[PDB]
Write a protein that binds this ligand. Structure first.
Ligand SMILES: [Mg+2]
Ligand SMILES: [Mg+2]
Ligand SMILES: [Mg+2]
Ligand SMILES: [Mg+2]
Ligand SMILES: [Mg+2]
Ligand SMILES: [Mg+2]
Ligand SMILES: [Mg+2]
Ligand SMILES: [Mg+2]
Ligand SMILES: [Mg+2]
Ligand SMILES: [Mg+2]
Ligand SMILES: [Mg+2]
Ligand SMILES: [Mg+2]
Ligand SMILES: [Mg+2]
Ligand SMILES: [Mg+2]
Ligand SMILES: [Mg+2]
Ligand SMILES: [Mg+2]
Ligand SMILES: [Mg+2]
Ligand SMILES: [Mg+2]
Ligand SMILES: [Mg+2]
Ligand SMILES: [Mg+2]
Ligand SMILES: [Mg+2]
Ligand SMILES: [Mg+2]
Ligand SMILES: [Mg+2]
Ligand SMILES: [Mg+2]
Ligand SMILES: [Mg+2]
Ligand SMILES: [Mg+2]
Ligand SMILES: [Mg+2]
Ligand SMILES: [Mg+2]
Ligand SMILES: [Mg+2]
Ligand SMILES: [Mg+2]
Ligand SMILES: [Mg+2]
Ligand SMILES: [Mg+2]
Ligand SMILES: [Mg+2]
Ligand SMILES: [Mg+2]
Ligand SMILES: [Mg+2]
Ligand SMILES: [Mg+2]
Ligand SMILES: [Mg+2]
Ligand SMILES: [Mg+2]
Ligand SMILES: [Mg+2]
Ligand SMILES: [Mg+2]
Ligand SMILES: [Mg+2]
Ligand SMILES: [Mg+2]
Ligand SMILES: [Mg+2]
Ligand SMILES: [Mg+2]
Ligand SMILES: [Mg+2]
Ligand SMILES: [Mg+2]
Ligand SMILES: [Mg+2]
Ligand SMILES: [Mg+2]
Ligand SMILES: [Mg+2]
Ligand SMILES: [Mg+2]
Ligand SMILES: [Mg+2]
Ligand SMILES: [Mg+2]
Ligand SMILES: [Mg+2]
Ligand SMILES: [Mg+2]
Ligand SMILES: [Mg+2]
Ligand SMILES: [Mg+2]
Ligand SMILES: [Mg+2]
Ligand SMILES: [Mg+2]
Ligand SMILES: [Mg+2]
Ligand SMILES: [Mg+2]
Ligand SMILES: [Mg+2]
Ligand SMILES: [Mg+2]
Ligand SMILES: [Mg+2]
Ligand SMILES: [Mg+2]
Length: 97
RNA sequence: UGUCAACCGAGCGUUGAUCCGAGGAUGUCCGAAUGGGGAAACCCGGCACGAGUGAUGUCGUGUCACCAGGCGCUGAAUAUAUAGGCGUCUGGGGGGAACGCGGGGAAGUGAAACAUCUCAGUACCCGUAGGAAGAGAAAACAAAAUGUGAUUCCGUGAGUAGUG
RNA sequence: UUCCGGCUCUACCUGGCUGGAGGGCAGUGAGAAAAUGUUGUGGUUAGCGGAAAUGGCUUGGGAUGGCCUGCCGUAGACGGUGAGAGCCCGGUACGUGAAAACCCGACGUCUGUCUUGAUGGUGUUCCCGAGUAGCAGCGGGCCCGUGGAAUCUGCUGUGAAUCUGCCGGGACCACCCGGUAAGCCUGAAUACUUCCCAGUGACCGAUAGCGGAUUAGUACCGUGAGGGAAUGGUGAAAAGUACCCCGGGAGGGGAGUGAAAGAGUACCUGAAACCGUGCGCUUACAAUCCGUCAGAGCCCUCGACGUGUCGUGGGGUGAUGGCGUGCC
RNA sequence: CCUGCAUCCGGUGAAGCCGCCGAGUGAUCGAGUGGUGGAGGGUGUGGGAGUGAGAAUGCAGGCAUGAGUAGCGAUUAGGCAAGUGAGAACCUUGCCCGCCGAAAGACCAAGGGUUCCUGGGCCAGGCCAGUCCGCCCAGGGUGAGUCGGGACCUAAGGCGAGGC
């Protein structure tokens, strides 16, 4: 999907637009991902009762990977003549990701 | 780590999971059912080779219909010979929405009734194969033109020549 | 328009029969059939690459809304993404691309007739598809519904000829004209979709649409053939209301979630029959297909004028008089 | 209502619904205004309609009166003390009374399949309330050389290799 676990991502649209974050888990079936620090929601937990803060899934279409230089970039692909492994490339820079 | 539909506990994966493409094995029982039996999915055996017990009782893998056509042997009352009887190979028993071929084959209804007719060779049934089928190489038309030249399928030829 | 051999009883010359070797002929073929040795980016069964705005200002819960600036276009088809997206995502134009297998086409051992044979003439003796053709009786379908009844055909009797032979031109005779049945194969033009792949709708949107948007030919009914049902929309995510209180629960009130809780799993929008609570007017001496035309009082209201009184004023109620025989 | 064409409106609130105020000679109209809602609509000119309800003893769904009226499904009949629990004439214990007793009792085959026991509760059901249940939940429960059948034999009848 051009997005993996452990990458750095930025939000384009939504309540928390303009905030950077780090991805935790991915859901390819529903095309949704979970990012900490964005879309924080209050949940009622009762067993002892209280209110806690958690994170809800965000659709990937509203987020995209950031460049190592701190700028938003798309994802490109290249073919290596050495091993043939497919690599991710920053379109606006050409550097590998 | 499919799904109805959350939830728990358990785990794998960079040494390539999951997925999809092609081929390959296993495939309980019934179901043309074909070792024998029978109220579908339940009862009972023969033979050969293996496994187990001091021996029976037990268990695994094979094989054990019928019909027709070839091939070989045999030849009754009865003599020639046949029928019949044995051994061995080759084929068939059912299913499928529509499409074809050859037969059988109905009644409602119109005629303001109704026997002839029409409904109709329709519905249905029977025996049949295929991916298509059937038909097919003039004992054919026409009429004085020195004409066409296997078969099949469409449009006209006309709702006319006829028939009731 | 090749060579040799053995045969036409036999050995020798003449004329014929049959085998072994060039050179053509075709071959998966209806004209004969079986197998065995080397090519197409031919397509198909998956995939992969694939261009351009985090633009500014505004309403906003959310921009994919409005105004102004850019860029790509062999890609402004189509869907998803928190409200109508060419430049966010899935992909579309275009390019590529397969281990194995499929089928088609082309390139290669092998099979077999003929060259013992072909070409143009002549008079004589034999052949050209048997219970068939035709004839007579009884039935079919051709427009022909036995009528004069041609042709084809089913059954029963009788029953013919081989080239100056035979059958056909709607009876039939004569003359002309066409043809050679009584044996067998033959692709192309045509008919259809239980299945699979790709596409379309001035076709339907939950009493419509296939009987079937959900437990579907299920439940259910019938011992049988068989008949045959109704049941979608919370919201962006469940964040499905912690906690406190009344209470057995059911159920409810605060406080929070959220845009809304006039969204609380009985959850979009919520009409009419139907049942209500509060408010205003009226009725207990009355003979009404239940309305209309007049019509005092009371109440609500809009203006100008003041305590309430008029006005090219509106509304609800109606005490009381006249009129008055539902719809198809 | 759906459509070709040219236009305008719309999260600063589009579609229905409920009012007020008005308007046309009709089937009606309002780009005039108020509440509810949240996602597509109007005008102009052409083309196509499953295009207009009150009645067929019509059909699908919902709801009126009779009505808080009749009944609450026999020929025996209950009463008392105590207990459980929020609730008891209908549940548990104890004591009186009555009834059946060729059955209103104890069993077989046919007939149903979990109604049997233990433990849980009482929004569905029991013609009323239910602590109870032939309500449901979860678990457990069915022991044959000698009992009934098969491996033993046969009838009225069915199948039927050959065959007619
Ligand atoms: Mg497979
Ligand atoms: Mg096996
Ligand atoms: Mg069998
Ligand atoms: Mg059998
Ligand atoms: Mg045979
Ligand atoms: Mg003999
Ligand atoms: Mg068959
Ligand atoms: Mg008549
Ligand atoms: Mg008549
Ligand atoms: Mg006819
Ligand atoms: Mg075939
Ligand atoms: Mg033919
Ligand atoms: Mg023929
Ligand atoms: Mg004609
Ligand atoms: Mg805004
Ligand atoms: Mg925009
Ligand atoms: Mg489009
Ligand atoms: Mg989207
Ligand atoms: Mg749309
Ligand atoms: Mg893709
Ligand atoms: Mg006739
Ligand atoms: Mg005639
Ligand atoms: Mg003539
Ligand atoms: Mg001639
Ligand atoms: Mg002939
Ligand atoms: Mg054809
Ligand atoms: Mg509806
Ligand atoms: Mg039945
Ligand atoms: Mg809120
Ligand atoms: Mg409801
Ligand atoms: Mg509602
Ligand atoms: Mg009075
Ligand atoms: Mg009077
Ligand atoms: Mg009157
Ligand atoms: Mg009167
Ligand atoms: Mg419309
Ligand atoms: Mg607009
Ligand atoms: Mg709005
Ligand atoms: Mg509003
Ligand atoms: Mg709304
Ligand atoms: Mg128009
Ligand atoms: Mg019009
Ligand atoms: Mg018309
Ligand atoms: Mg209509
Ligand atoms: Mg009506
Ligand atoms: Mg009704
Ligand atoms: Mg009534
Ligand atoms: Mg009463
Ligand atoms: Mg009574
Ligand atoms: Mg009773
Ligand atoms: Mg009691
Ligand atoms: Mg008694
Ligand atoms: Mg007695
Ligand atoms: Mg008795
Ligand atoms: Mg029984
Ligand atoms: Mg039983
Ligand atoms: Mg019990
Ligand atoms: Mg209980
Ligand atoms: Mg109860
Ligand atoms: Mg009940
Ligand atoms: Mg129970
Ligand atoms: Mg036993
Ligand atoms: Mg018999
Ligand atoms: Mg037989």
């Amino acid at each position: 999907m051009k997005v993996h676990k452990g990458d750095t991502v930025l939000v384009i649209s939504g309540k928390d637009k303009g905030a950077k974050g780090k991805v935790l888990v991915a859901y390819p079936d529903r095309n949704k991902v979970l990012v900490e620090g964005v879309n924080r929601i209050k949940k009622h937990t009762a067993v002892s009762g209280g209110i806690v803060t958690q994170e809800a899934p965000i659709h990937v279409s509203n987020v995209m990977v950031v460049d190592s230089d701190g700028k938003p970039t798309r994802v490109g692909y290249r073919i290596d003549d050495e091993t043939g492994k497919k690599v991710r490339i920053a379109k606006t820079n050409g550097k590998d990701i």
